[PDB]
């Protein structure tokens, strides 16, 4: 039955028991219910009034911390001769929470999640260290970040007419500012995001398993707005996400083996315990061996 | 206009901050809520559910064999069967449990625990066991006459399949501390040990060897504080397909 | 300890049950007008769909790793439920699951019986995702490769967070679970997404010294509160 | 928005200042108080002892 709980529970004084037909220490695990034996039924107790708070384990507090989700480095220079795989003074990123493991493992404790996302963008720069270069000072560049929906058109070059942003949201910011920040709403076509998805995305059999495009937040497109200088620099962009206004359903077993890919749940494990496929806990010599046994002298 | 001045901490980015911030999509309407089963609001709701201990963490036990303890008939009285270390932050039988995994995101803990054991022998098998908890101060006990001076329960096999041992909160300080030292007076919990009270006795057509499954959970007096990055996960590289998000 | 279940033209009796489980404390129901989306009048077959179907039995043996089935996929070809599934674009229902296994007073062994929501499987020792034929087994179901990590790199030890029961051969001979609708959307297309996976895992292996015999495990499943929308021509897997 | 201007002393760090500042650990509960003998509140209480 639902109730409001702000502190851990009190303990009550208890006496000797010797009663026929009553056995509070015996239980029936096969039913699937957890044991209901209380401390006052197992031992003699004193009265204790308990003042410990429970707020640091609220779900909003557990999940609502800013975590790293993207890190990209690119060269700011004249790109006239660069190969086609290069980030030529701009890049595109498809927003996901799967690339850095500390955020991924925390979100994967739940089956469904509903939240708004607060996004923070941090930028840094350095002079390129070729043997022709001294240090020279660092420029205060302007950057543009444009938000683009999943599968929509994205810019092909640093000076494309696509950057005119007539209905797309854009943010412009300088390297000397505090980090840029904005909130993206809960955008799903369903009432919650699916953290796990046991199905296929399309009507034909050849589609991807475990991927559901309705859960993808969108694309972020980022460029330097300035023209290139006479000398090259390296620019690094970091993106942070903080969930807020959170609801969560159906808790799950935590991940134990290392992650392999952002695309799926595949596994391999360590070569030896802990976290090997055949052994999650580190070994001891026997079930009678106490591993940190105190020695008296 | 208003006269103002800037304080120390102006322009910093702190990852645990809490402020309003500019909406990207004005006039946007989010999808209506509907009822979904199994909503959770405090992580202490999850920590109260029983999960299996890996008591048989030995070199010869592979996969599911690590989740059970096998017991058999003995020729000698008062014998030790197994023991369990109680240090719920460290690597050991308690770590890969609902209470162990959630606790390793925090640094301080308090409150009582319960261990429950289920007997999985045949219907015709009989026996009695004694389960003991010893408060800290010296070495783990190795004889029944030493262990029975601690907190204990004597268990009879029968129509009820399972027994609970309460591990009561007994501490000088309000909290225990997940410092990286098993022998600290702020960290050590003591020991659990199991002995024969009589013997395992079975007829010729039953199997000569029977198994125990052990479970652990917290009581509702339990508390956690001072959140940290979990040591149960990490990476040295980018994952496979992580580059394809940029292409 | 004693139980009778009656749905449509079907009944089950058991003399050695251990209560029964309702997932998350819920019970199945039809979709109310304040949660609805599709505007057409729904098909509600009642006793034609909402009844027990029994799958093939499986043999419990000394080397068994455990077994699994996906819902609705395991029922998509069976009776009037399969016919309604093939003629409609959208479906919704709950389920009632009953698992059966018996042996003598001289046998020992224990099964975990668990219902997992959104059990997205992983492959072992490769970067490539599972294919359509790895997932969509139909009425035959499949077997676990690595039950200790649930074939997804989590663990068996924590699987008790999901709706579950045990069969322990000295205590009981059946397990029963009631499942509500469990999805982010009010209805779904039944041929491409599975809401629930039933898993049966032998945590303590079968053993005795009496006369040897074949010990089967049997699964019966009943849909509850079925609804269908978007009538068209028949389409199969 | 609000029209503002900055005064002399903006951005300085003075070691005798008194302001609120951002909490590192949100929702944290400090340990309950209990009675301890010999509390002191003004240093002039100590200076009165021989």
């Amino acid at each position: 039955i639902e109730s409001i709980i702000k502190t851990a529970t009190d303990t009550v004084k208890s006496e000797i028991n010797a009663e026929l037909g009553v056995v509070p220490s015996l239980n029936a695990v096969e039913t699937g219910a957890t044991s209901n034996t209380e401390p006052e039924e197992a031992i003699q107790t004193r009265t204790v009034i308990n003042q410990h708070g429970v707020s640091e384990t609220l779900v909003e507090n557990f999940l609502s911390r800013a975590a790293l989700v993207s890190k990209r480095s690119f060269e700011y220079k004249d790109h006239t001769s660069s190969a086609a795989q290069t980030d030529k003074n701009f890049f595109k990123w498809t927003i996901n929470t799967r690339s850095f493991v500390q955020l991924r493992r925390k979100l994967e404790l739940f089956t469904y999640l509903r939240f708004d996302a607060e996004i923070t963008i941090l930028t840094t720069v350095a002079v390129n260290g070729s043997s022709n270069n001294t240090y020279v000072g660092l420029p205060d560049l302007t950057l543009q970040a444009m938000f683009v929906p999943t599968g929509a058109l994205t810019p092909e070059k640093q000076d494309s007419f696509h950057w005119q942003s007539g209905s797309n949201a854009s943010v412009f910011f300088k390297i000397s500012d505090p980090p840029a920040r904005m909130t993206i709403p809960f955008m799903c076509i369903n009432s919650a995001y699916s953290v796990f998805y046991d199905g296929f995305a399309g009507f034909e059999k050849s589609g991807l398993y475990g991927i559901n495009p309705a859960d993808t937040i969108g694309n972020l497109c980022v460029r330097i707005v300035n023209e290139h200088q006479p000398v090259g620099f390296t620019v690094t962009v970091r993106v942070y996400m903080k969930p807020k206004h959170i609801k969560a359903w159906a808790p799950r077993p935590p991940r134990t083996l290392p992650y392999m890919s952002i695309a799926n749940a595949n596994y391999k494990g360590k070569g030896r315990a802990p976290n090997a496929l055949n052994a999650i806990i580190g070994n001891r010599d026997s079930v009678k061996t106490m591993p940190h046994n105190i020695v008296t002298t | 206009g208003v006269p103002t001045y800037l304080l120390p901490g102006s322009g910093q980015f702190l990852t645990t901050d809490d402020h309003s911030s500019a909406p990207v999509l004005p006039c946007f309407n989010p999808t209506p809520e509907m009822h979904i089963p199994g909503q959770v609001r405090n992580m202490l709701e999850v920590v109260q559910v029983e999960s299996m201990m890996e008591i048989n963490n030995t070199e010869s036990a592979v996969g599911m064999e690590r989740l059970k303890v096998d017991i058999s008939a003995l020729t000698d009285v008062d014998q030790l069967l197994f023991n369990i270390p109680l240090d719920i932050q460290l690597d050991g039988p308690l770590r890969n449990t609902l209470v162990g995994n959630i606790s390793r995101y925090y640094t301080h803990w308090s409150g009582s625990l319960e261990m429950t054991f289920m007997f999985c022998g045949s219907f015709m098998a009989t026996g009695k066991l004694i389960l003991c908890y010893t408060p800290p101060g010296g070495s783990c006990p190795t004889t029944r006459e030493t262990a029975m001076l601690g907190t204990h329960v004597v268990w009879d096999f029968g129509l009820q399949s399972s027994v609970t041992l309460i591990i009561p909160w007994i501490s000088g300080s309000h909290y225990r501390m997940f410092n990286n030292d098993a022998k600290s007076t702020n960290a050590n919990v003591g020991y659990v040990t199991c002995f024969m009270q009589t013997n395992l006795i079975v007829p010729s057509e039953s199997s000569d060897t029977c198994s125990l499954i052990g479970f652990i959970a917290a009581k509702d007096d339990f508390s956690l504080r001072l959140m940290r990055d979990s040591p149960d996960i990490g990476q040295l590289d980018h994952l496979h397909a992580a580059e394809a998000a940029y292409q | 300890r004693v139980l009778q279940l009656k749905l449509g033209n079907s009944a089950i009796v058991t003399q050695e049950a251990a209560n029964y489980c309702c997932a998350y404390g819920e019970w199945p129901n039809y979709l109310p007008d304040h949660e609805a989306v599709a505007i057409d009048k729904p098909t509600q077959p009642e006793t034609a769909t909402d009844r027990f179907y029994t799958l093939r039995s499986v043999k419990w043996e000394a080397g068994s790793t455990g077994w699994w089935w996906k819902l609705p996929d395991a029922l998509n070809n069976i009776g009037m439920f399969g016919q309604n599934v093939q003629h409609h674009y959208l479906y919704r229902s709950g389920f009632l699951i009953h698992v059966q296994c018996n042996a003598t007073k001289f046998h020992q062994g224990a099964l975990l019986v668990v219902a997992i929501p959104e059990h997205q499987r992983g492959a072992h020792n490769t970067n490539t995702s599972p294919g359509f034929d790895d997932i969509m087994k139909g009425e035959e179901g499949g077997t676990f490769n690595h039950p200790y990590v649930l074939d997804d790199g989590t663990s068996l030890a924590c699987a008790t967070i999901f709706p579950h029961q045990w069969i322990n051969l000295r205590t009981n001979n059946s397990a029963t679970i009631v499942l509500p609708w469990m999805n982010a959307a009010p209805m779904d297309f039944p041929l491409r997404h599975n809401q629930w996976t039933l898993a049966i895992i032998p945590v303590v292996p079968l053993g005795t010294r009496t006369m040897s015999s074949m010990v089967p495990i049997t699964v019966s499943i009943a849909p509850m509160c079925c609804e269908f929308n978007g009538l068209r021509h028949a389409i199969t897997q | 928005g609000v029209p503002t201007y900055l005064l002399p002393g903006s951005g300085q760090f003075l070691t005798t200042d008194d302001h609120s500042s951002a909490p590192v650990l949100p929702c944290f509960n400090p340990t309950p108080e209990m009675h301890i003998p010999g509390q002191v509140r003004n240093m002039l209480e100590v200076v009165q002892v021989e």
């Binding site: 909003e60 | 309003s20 199994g38 709701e45 109260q48 | 209560n19 | 949100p26």
Partner: peptide, 30 residues
Amino acid sequence: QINFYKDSYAASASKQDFSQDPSKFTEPVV
């Protein structure tokens, strides 16, 4: 708490819901 934005999703985090029901996970039986 300070908020001058028009859209309600722009607001700070909400940390005041102390309602619980462990029994849906610990006692899911009839």
